[PDB]
């Protein structure tokens, strides 16, 4: 049987159930006054290596590189007619995917104990991305059957690539950090939207018994999004299903005039000019002179 809902339920129930139990724990901790070791190690046991410390690269840089790996595995999965049983055990497949996802679970737990507020942490974007990526892999290995669900959401982990480039001191001027931040927001949004359209087109409209589905590859969806958002629109590839049409109307109305129609790029494209030099690179052996005052 094709038990798609069991994978999806694992993400839904962990997200909303965790939200409930946090809200209830808080509420009862207050109502307690109307009815009238553990706290110490969290500040160092992961926080000494999670971020911003001198060698605390791993739990931002490695989780980024592993997120790219998981996204690549989703691209591998997207290349098959969703019914293949060789690339399933003792190849790489689900068994290599699991090694990324258990690290994501451990890193999420470390973040959860480190969280200054549990509620605001629970509905933070990267927490949501983890809830819709991590539980269904455990379902997939318990049921021992791979699934092409919302795993494309790992592309949102590229948002913070701007941090990696400054932690590694590759980027050192603020306007270029803003430029790369905006560029990564563009690329990650493009790949995410292409994932939604890929899912929605390959599974038909339910009111038509899923019969009207369209066999697009993920790369045809990436191309379709590009040909659409540039407003070229050849119509060699386009969305056929009713849900596909709904998603495209939303993506056109949000991609234009809300996601585009930014001003930052017109002020930051001169960013590489509105800063004039860092520090003089004093070579050995050559003499050196400074001139200042009224310079014209």
């Amino acid at each position: 049987q094709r038990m798609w809902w069991a994978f999806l339920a694992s993400s839904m129930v962990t997200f909303f159930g965790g939200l409930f139990i946090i809200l209830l724990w808080r509420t009862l901790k207050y109502l307690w006054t109307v009815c009238c070791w553990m706290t110490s190690v969290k500040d160092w046991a992961g926080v000494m290596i999670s971020a911003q410390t001198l060698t605390g690269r791993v739990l931002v840089v490695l989780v980024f590189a592993l997120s790219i790996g998981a996204l690549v595995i989703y691209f591998i999965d997207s290349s098959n007619p969703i019914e293949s049983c060789q690339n399933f055990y003792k190849d790489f497949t689900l068994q290599i995917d699991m090694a990324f996802n258990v690290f994501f679970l451990l890193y999420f737990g470390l973040r959860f104990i480190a969280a200054n507020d549990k509620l605001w942490f629970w509905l933070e974007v990267n927490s949501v991305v983890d809830f819709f990526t991590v539980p269904p892999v455990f379902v997939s290995v318990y049921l021992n059957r791979s699934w092409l669900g919302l795993r494309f959401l790992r592309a949102l982990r590229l948002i913070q690539f701007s941090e990696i480039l400054q932690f590694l001191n590759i980027l050192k001027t603020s306007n270029s950090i803003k430029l790369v931040n905006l560029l990564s927001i563009f690329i990650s949004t493009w790949l995410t939207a292409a994932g939604f359209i890929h899912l929605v087109e390959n599974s038909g409209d339910p009111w038509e018994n899923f019969q009207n589905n369209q066999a697009l590859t993920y790369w045809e969806c990436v191309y379709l999004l590009m040909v659409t958002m540039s407003t070229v629109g050849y119509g060699d590839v386009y969305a056929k299903t009713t849900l596909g049409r709904l998603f495209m109307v939303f993506f056109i109305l949000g991609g234009l005039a809300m996601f585009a129609s930014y001003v930052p790029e017109i002020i930051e494209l001169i960013g590489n000019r509105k800063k004039y030099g860092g520090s003089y690179s004093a070579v050995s052996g050559r003499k050196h002179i400074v001139v200042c005052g009224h310079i014209t």
């Binding site: 939200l19 207050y30 009111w207």
Partner: protein, 197 residues
Amino acid sequence: ALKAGEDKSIRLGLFLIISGVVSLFIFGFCWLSPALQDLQATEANCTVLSVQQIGEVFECTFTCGADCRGTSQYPCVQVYVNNSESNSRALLHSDEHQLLTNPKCSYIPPCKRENQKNLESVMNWQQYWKDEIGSQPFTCYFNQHQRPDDVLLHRTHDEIVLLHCFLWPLVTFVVGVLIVVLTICAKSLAVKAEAMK
């Protein structure tokens, strides 16, 4: 401080509410025309009048895996019934998709790689209905409001997909209003309980 994050819960609550409502309207407009049509087909009682072939031959496509698209022939069986609600002759089809993919014939075999197996399948179906002539009446689905010439063995949709489609957006609306109520407590009863310290 809690308040700086608590209104994010408000926004999320509100989003889940309006999302549920909008989803209910969207799924409404697109389900209702199919669903209405598929319940406009009454259920009636039927018995077969006769079983025969009209000699005409039709094409079908066999998918031998991975975009294979070969084609094979099959002969056209027709079956007709007595009808308890119209008391007039009507032509038996298995289902709405079968009628749609060939409205000329009472059956379509699962299209095989060789004509002899399509043949054999049609005969294997025909001999069953050659026993169901008159003996042991059956229920039949019938649509005199728009298509009075034909009857079906089954409805177009399974009701689970319809109700399963409608309940989850309603459930997300319920979760949304629940989340905003819990936050209203964790906002107001919190300060009412904490200001006493």
